[PDB]
């Protein structure tokens, strides 16, 4: 991805957009009960903690575009992945406005919380004023579509979240490039059934895990994998995507029956954004921060891995590549060992920066013992080995519980963390609960005991 130009929005007929400058994150009642080192990300140029230009830092993610056209290796990758998706008999029919808005089997309703984007953000109009869960009214939305159309600028927001001290000082805050409600709705009408099919089929055929439930899905992943695992991390995946990857995605869509609306992919590839009082044009790069792009980023990841394997290992049998992606995150396997370091080298030529899995200093063999997916390790249950626990280390959980964004959601926040932590074992879980109950706020919470969670897990299969 590359920024073509940037300048005063006024010069191009757009208004100044107002975005919060103060974090909603504040120390929680557990701030001194647990260890942690993360702080709220810098949200403005004037933040005292900054040690470099903020504007430069947040847009440095656009490293440029390494490739223009789709080569022969990418074409083969497209043919193989598209052929694989064809086995799912995905309904190519457009989804009606109602379901696209309020959800249906395999697709959740629009998030009434998130931004409505332009121009609604500048008109002070919220989603709550357009959508009616109880009525499932599409009248209002339909008139807004007719009035403002599609292909609207994306509203850029800085993400309010915890970051390491280094990322804070270097102003390395992540961004949210919100699509207008109009575009979000139009894209779900065009691809709604595709989204539903992926959400309903997490695994090695879709090569996707979006919409998955780790508590249950972890037990299914191992049997789908080939003998030798391989993985790696990407540095700034979304922003690094070159225009060629978007063209390869359109080819996949065309082959599976959506050639009808590949134009929507262009909107993601060549897009314009509004940030504060400026407007800018980007070539390449997947608009980041929102879930609406999770599926497309996952599909593209399937194309990238296939391409690098074909380019690095002529004669590779893709029918035996078994991988599952969630955006840029991935767990993959093949019957034979492969060299991730070599694959990373090939990746540079395609505009991708690949590094050792889980932040290792060197590319080491990936095993069921050290592999992680969505930050969770895999651990067989002591009593029932066939049941696999998704294990997220307590470090991140401890980092999270030390801050709060709303005193009213304290119990939901802590309960969600408990659902993650108990997988670490009864001993660790009880220590976690004991510390929570060492302060008044914690003692007033209704939290599940270990045996209660273990029983509920067994009863969920």
CA–CA dist 367, 365 (Å, integer): 6
Instruction: Give the x-and-dash track for 274-293 against Na ion (CB under 5 A).
Output: --------x--x--------
Q: How far is the CB of 275 from Na ion (least distance, A)?
A: 14
Measured CA angle at 344 (ends 54, 284), to 5 deg: 50
Cβ nearer to Na ion, comparing 99 with 238: 238
Q: For residues 442 and 448, is the Cβ–Cβ distance under 8 A?
A: no
Q: How far is the CB of 304 from Na ion (least distance, A)?
A: 17
Report the candidate in 195, 209, 375, 213 with the shortest Cα–Cα distance to residue 292. 195
Measured CA angle at 359 (ends 202, 345), to 5 deg: 85
Residues comprising the chain, all counted: 461
Q: How far is the CB of 11 from Na ion (least distance, A)?
A: 21
Q: How far is the CB of 285 from Na ion (least distance, A)?
A: 4
Cβ nearer to Na ion, comparing 192 with 285: 285
Q: How far is the CB of 243 from Na ion (least distance, A)?
A: 9
Report the candidate in 91, 148, 85, 154 with the shortest Cα–Cα distance to residue 117. 154
Site for Na ion in 57-116 (CB under 5 A): none
CA–CA dist 43, 389 (Å, integer): 37
Print the SS3 string covering 316-376: CCHHHCEEEEECCEEEEEECCCCCHHHHHHHHHCCCCCEEEHHHCCCCCCCCCCCCCECCE
Site for Na ion in 255-274 (CB under 5 A): 271
Q: Is 260 annotated as a binding residue?
A: no
Write down the H helix ranges in 10-104.
54-59, 72-86, 97-102
Q: How far is the CB of 152 from Na ion (least distance, A)?
A: 14
CA–CA dist 268, 252 (Å, integer): 16
> Does 243 contact Na ion by CB under 5 A?
no
Cβ nearer to Na ion, comparing 102 with 246: 246
Cβ nearer to Na ion, comparing 214 with 284: 284
434-to-245, 350, 391 alpha-carbon distances in Å = 50, 50, 20
Residues 218, 224, 229, 231: what is their CA dihedral angle, to the nearest 10 degrees? -60
Q: For residues 282 and 62, is the Cβ–Cβ distance under 8 A?
A: yes
Q: How far is the CB of 77 from Na ion (least distance, A)?
A: 21
Residues binding Na ion: number (CB under 5 A): 3
Cβ nearer to Na ion, comparing 271 with 279: 271
Cβ nearer to Na ion, comparing 158 with 231: 158
Q: Is 71 annotated as a binding residue?
A: no
First to last CA, the chain: 43
Binding residue positions for Mg(2+):
233, 328
> Which residues bind to Na ion, rule: CB under 5 A?
271, 282, 285
């Amino acid at each position: 991805g590359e920024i073509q130009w940037m300048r005063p929005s006024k010069e191009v007929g757009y208004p100044i957009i107002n975005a919060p400058s103060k974090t909603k994150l504040e120390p929680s009642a557990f701030h001194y009960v647990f260890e942690g080192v993360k702080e709220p990300a810098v949200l403005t140029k004037n933040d005292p903690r900054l040690k470099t230009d903020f504007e430069e830092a947040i847009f440095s993610k656009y490293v440029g575009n390494k490739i223009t056209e789709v080569d022969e290796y990418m074409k083969e990758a497209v043919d193989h992945y598209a052929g694989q998706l064809m086995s799912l008999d995905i309904n190519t029919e457009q989804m009606c406005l109602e379901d696209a808005m309020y959800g249906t089997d395999g697709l959740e309703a629009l998030d009434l919380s998130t931004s409505a984007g332009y121009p609604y953000v500048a008109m002070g109009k919220k989603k709550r004023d357009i959508l009616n869960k109880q009525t499932r009214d599409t009248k209002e939305m339909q008139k807004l579509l007719d009035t403002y159309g599609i292909n609207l600028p994306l509203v850029t927001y800085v993400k309010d979240e915890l970051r390491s001290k280094t990322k804070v000082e270097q102003g390395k805050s992540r961004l949210i490039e919100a699509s207008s409600l109009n575009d979000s709705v139009a894209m779900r009408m065009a691809f709604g059934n595709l989204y539903a099919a992926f959400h309903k089929n997490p695994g090695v055929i879709t090569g996707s895990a979006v919409g998955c439930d780790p508590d249950l899905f972890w037990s299914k992943i191992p049997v789908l994998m080939e003998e030798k695992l391989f993985a790696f991390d990407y540095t700034g995946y979304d922003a690094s995507l070159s225009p060629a990857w978007f063209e390869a995605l359109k080819m996949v869509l065309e082959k599976i029956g959506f050639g009808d609306r590949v134009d929507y992919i262009d909107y993601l590839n060549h897009s314009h954004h509004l940030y504060k009082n400026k407007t800018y044009c980007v070539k390449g790069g997947m608009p980041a921060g929102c879930s609406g792009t999770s599926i497309f980023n996952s599909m593209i990841n399937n194309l990238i891995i296939r391409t690098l394997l074909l380019k690095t290992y002529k004669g590779i049998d893709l029918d035996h590549l078994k991988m599952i992606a969630y955006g840029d995150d991935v767990i993959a396997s093949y019957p034979h060992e492969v060299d991730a370091s070599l694959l990373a080298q090939s990746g540079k030529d395609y505009g991708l920066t690949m590094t050792p899995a889980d932040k290792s200093a060197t590319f080491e063999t990936v095993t069921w013992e050290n592999v992680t997916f969505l930050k969770r390790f895999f651990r067989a249950d002591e009593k029932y080995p066939f049941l696999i626990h998704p294990v997220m280390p307590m470090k991140e959980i401890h980092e999270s519980i030390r801050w709060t964004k709303d005193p009213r959601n304290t119990q939901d926040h802590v309960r969600s963390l408990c659902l993650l932590a108990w997988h670490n074992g009864e001993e660790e879980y009880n220590k976690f609960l004991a510390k929570i109950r060492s302060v008044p706020i914690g003692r007033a919470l209704d939290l599940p005991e270990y045996s209660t969670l273990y029983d509920r897990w067994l009863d969920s299969f």
